[PDB]
Design a protein around this nucleic acid. Sequence first.
DNA 1: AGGAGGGCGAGGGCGATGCCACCTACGGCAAGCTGACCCTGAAGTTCATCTGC
Length: 205
Amino acid sequence: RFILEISGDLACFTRSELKVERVSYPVITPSAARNILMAILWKPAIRWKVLKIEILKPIQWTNIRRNEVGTKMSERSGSLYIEDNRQQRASMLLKDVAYRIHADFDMTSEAGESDNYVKFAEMFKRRAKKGQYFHQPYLGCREFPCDFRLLEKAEDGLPLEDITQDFGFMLYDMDFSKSDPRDSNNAEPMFYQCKAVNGVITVPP
DNA sequence: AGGAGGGCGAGGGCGATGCCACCTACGGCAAGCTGACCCTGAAGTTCATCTGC
């Protein structure tokens, strides 16, 4: 288990419902929490698994309308001209977040030869303490960086001390099981937070 | 010639240096306008275009 300690000035774990008008999930999504732990280290042998988020700064919001673009980019049309494809996505962002994601991982079917769980474990451990990553972890949106740390047990004060808000059914981790290589056909599994007692435990599927 | 050229101690004492009121009146402190254009939508289909046949 790794008690990595994602933190950042802003964060947007955009609720699936309020995607066009981004309203962040009140805490780190276990998908966004996990994909962060793939940004620091991943390989198609490691399969990350968030075991317990722990909120470390209170759920505080700042709305940010960004002139986002409306349409994907495409081989077909060789430019956007944003002023033609403009959209103004509001973003109820999570200001001053922090999350100590108690996450571990497993070995996939394609673990390869060097399937050593300890190898990837210490690889990620060195990456996180050193600060290395494949990708500066995205707090839900890459516009938001995860000023992370690989805590050992506990090195920050979690604010939802007494029993606190149950954020309801949050996106857990989009189901890339039916997908071929590179996540084509997925689905969304979702979870009762369970509550936020003081740091939400997640459910392994 | 050799003189002596003041010695003394007073040089204010007393009180008053203001009294009276007034220190503003009047009214106005805004008028008139604008405070935004423009777009950017969901949802769906069409339509032009592409790939494959």
